[PDB]
Amino acid sequence: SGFRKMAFPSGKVEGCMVQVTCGTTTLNGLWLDDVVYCPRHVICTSEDMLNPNYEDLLIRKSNHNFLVQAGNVQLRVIGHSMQNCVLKLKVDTANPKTPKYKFVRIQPGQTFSVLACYNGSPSGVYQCAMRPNFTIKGSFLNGSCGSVGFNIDYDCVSFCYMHHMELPTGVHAGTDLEGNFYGPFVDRQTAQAAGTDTTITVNVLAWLYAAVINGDRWFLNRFTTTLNDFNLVAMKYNYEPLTQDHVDILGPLSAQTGIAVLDMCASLKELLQNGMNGRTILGSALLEDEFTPFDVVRQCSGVT
Amino acid sequence: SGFRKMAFPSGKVEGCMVQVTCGTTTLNGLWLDDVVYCPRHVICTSEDMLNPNYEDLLIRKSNHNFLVQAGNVQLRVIGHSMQNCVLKLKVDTANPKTPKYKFVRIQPGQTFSVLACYNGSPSGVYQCAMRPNFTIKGSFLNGSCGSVGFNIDYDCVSFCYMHHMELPTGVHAGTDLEGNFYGPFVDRQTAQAAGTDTTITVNVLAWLYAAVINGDRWFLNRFTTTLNDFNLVAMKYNYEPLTQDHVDILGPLSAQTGIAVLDMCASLKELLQNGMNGRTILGSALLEDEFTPFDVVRQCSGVT
Ligand SMILES: Oc1ccccc1CNc1nc2ccccc2[nH]1
Ligand SMILES: Oc1ccccc1CNc1nc2ccccc2[nH]1
Incomplete structure (x- = not known):
């Protein structure tokens, strides 16, 4: 647990x-x-x-x-x-x-590990998500450029990120390992503003499932919703739209907890509208969006 | 940044x-x-x-x-x-x-890395603190016992923790590498309740300094306090007492930011009394206590 x-x-x-x-x-x-x-x-x-x-x-x-x-x-x-x-x-x-390795270009909402390095020497490791605005919120000092982001599938490292830039707002931009920037950023010391940093809805839902699995259930409500109704509320709160592909992906967490995805959506909707009222979920006072459904299953099952 | x-x-x-x-x-x-x-x-x-x-x-x-x-x-x-x-x-x-390695017995409030393992195979790494009640809030499934906590000083691993137990409240207990439990816990499936999980005050202050260094300054107030006045407020909010040893330890962060420790204490006091009013600090809606002053200096300086 x-x-x-x-x-x-x-x-x-x-x-x-x-x-x-x-x-x-x-x-x-x-x-x-x-x-x-x-x-x-x-x-x-x-x-x-x-x-x-x-x-x-x-x-x-x-x-x-x-x-x-x-x-x-x-x-x-x-x-x-x-x-x-x-x-x-x-x-x-x-x-x-x-x-064993692959180069992969991840999608916004995908999580990965960063090995922060200075002078070719590892200093630390942390977990990130590609933000919907194609930035990441890293920890990168001068000399950290060329630090990489990765996922591991048993013994195969999938490299998804190389660190290049800090934007004037102190968020981070970089490339896949083919040198292509995530989003519209360029390796030039010029005015580059990020778009809206929306919340990764499917990831929040996954983490709400992780919370139920770990005994934090106080936020579970008596309501359900529809994708369309939920999505109206999501937009108002700068949450990414939820698609049927997201509902399908949450299926195994739905099954494990016996909470239908649209029920968990209606619980999330009430948390958006009502806030946390000074309560915490998995020791957070805000809704965490940097776990994928795959991350929740991995950590809750115990893959190595 | x-x-x-x-x-x-x-x-x-x-x-x-x-x-x-x-x-x-x-x-x-x-x-x-x-x-x-x-x-x-x-x-x-x-x-x-x-x-x-x-x-x-x-x-x-x-x-x-x-x-x-x-x-x-x-x-x-x-x-x-x-x-x-x-x-x-x-x-x-x-x-x-x-x-190169040492066995060290850490004090409550000290942070370390855990390598979560299953069948001798690493699954993940996360950062913990020894809680003031000598528990840790880990992520440990069946088979994770013998997973260890460590600090690294350049090329020397200091082993401070081996995982043994989950308490009925789903918090974690274990030993140093000499087999001595942190706190009063025993390796027996019996009633073992944890004491008060107080907030590690010195760590919150360190993290408030980290926030100022990274441009999050909204919480900086016009007040100061004394150790005794601050400590009265700390106790009321289940915060560990702050000692002069803690003030001395924060000295370098005080120096870097030009914010006297007792000023940052008075900012923390107002955050306790007034709450966050829906605002975040370093993307948290609560006060983080799992960075030591040493951690903040390391990450803000860039040690490898
Ligand atoms: O949904 C929102 C709610 C509030 C602010 C901004 C947005 C836009 N979010 C968005 N996600 C996308 C995924 C693929 C293509 C276009 C996309 N736009
Ligand atoms: O300060 C508190 C505020 C609220 C609840 C509980 C406590 C006790 N905390 C405490 N830290 C200690 C360190 C060394 C020895 C004894 C200690 N007791």
Whole structure:
């Protein structure tokens, strides 16, 4: 029993983190097979960052300009290419600790673990969601760029995120491992405002199920609703719309608890309209939206 | 910028987790050097758990009765002893992945990372505090016993917790790595009630400093207080007393933010008396007490 914001064990990713230096810029790289992936802005002076032309900046760079260090041993760079907003540095040594891995582009509402790194050295691990505005609310100081987000399926690491940017509002933007930004963000020190950070409705419902499973039941009401009625209320409160795909996904939690999804929707509706009245659910005074239904099932079942 | 509940990278501890089986009971063990540490209740039938005599139960056990598996390879047990509420199983192989380590007994309010394990396999990592009532609020299913809590100082893992028990209220109890329970709990399926789960005042203050550092300043008031005045209010709200040792410990956060500790106390006092009025601090609707001052400095500075 008990329910925690839980990251994947980070060991498999710890074994992939290296330091990348280009001139005076140091950040982190991900070493898989004989390729090191890092944010292309490693080649910029903070001066360059205001309106960088990366193709033109890259012409001035050689393999020997990229200094790649794995522990306290240097890797030999034998090639470099730009793919979207990441650099791929070919090194002469396959990472001996390369895990089984995939590159995946996640959808808004999907959760993942971040291994926060500085100078290629892991500092911490936390759980995130891709926000509906394609930002994440991370913890990232200078030097944390190239830190990655991942899910693990038994022994296969799915890399979904590389850290590139902090927006002027102190939220975070980055790319998948093909170098494509989540949302409309660009690796340039310019005015970039995020859209509405809506609540991930399907995730709140999952977490309400987690609460029932763990004995927190005070919020369970006598009402039901319809998708359309619930969705009217969701919009008013800056909650993402709930689809039938979300209802289907919650099916196993519905089954385990014997609470129909639309009943749990009507409980959520009353919590939106009435608030928590100073009460807590799973030790939170607000509705948590950074657990997926899959996360709740994993943690409530005990997958390794 | 940004502030997350952050666990230590778990790789060094992942490399120490094994499966321990005695008869039909499977749980986790910690393999350091040529010793495997596990909860002594591995020797009990759930029937034994009602009033176990562990010395008498252990007489009926041999080295060959303890099945220790590290990945899918069996370790040979060449000795076993009981130290308090843990078993130490001497195996014929030193763990090749043993990190530098210490055993430390933490104080209430101290935070640590838990690597939740099932059948010797890591499932997740989260950050905890030892509660003032010597419980922890974990996430632990059947088979999670022998999962450990740790801090890391660069390359040295300090093991502070091994998981043994869930109380009938679904909070968690366990031992240090010398087998001594935190608080008054015993490894017996009997009536064990926790005392008052008070809020860790010094930790809330640290987190209020973290909030100021990260731009959340709305709660900063025009008042100050004294330790004695603040402490009267703390007691009324089930907050731990604040000592001069706590004020001294917050000194560096006081310095960084230019907010005197007693000023931040007076801000906390107003939040206790007035509540949050539907506002959030670092995305929480309640006051977080599971960051130490050391945690706030680490995450705000970027230690690896
Ligand atoms: O639903 C809302 C409630 C309040 C504010 C903003 C929104 C828009 N949310 C939204 N989710 C989407 C998913 C796919 C495509 C477009 C989407 N727009
Ligand atoms: O302060 C309180 C406010 C409300 C309820 C309970 C308490 C007691 N808290 C407490 N912390 C201690 C630390 C060391 C020794 C004894 C201690 N008692």
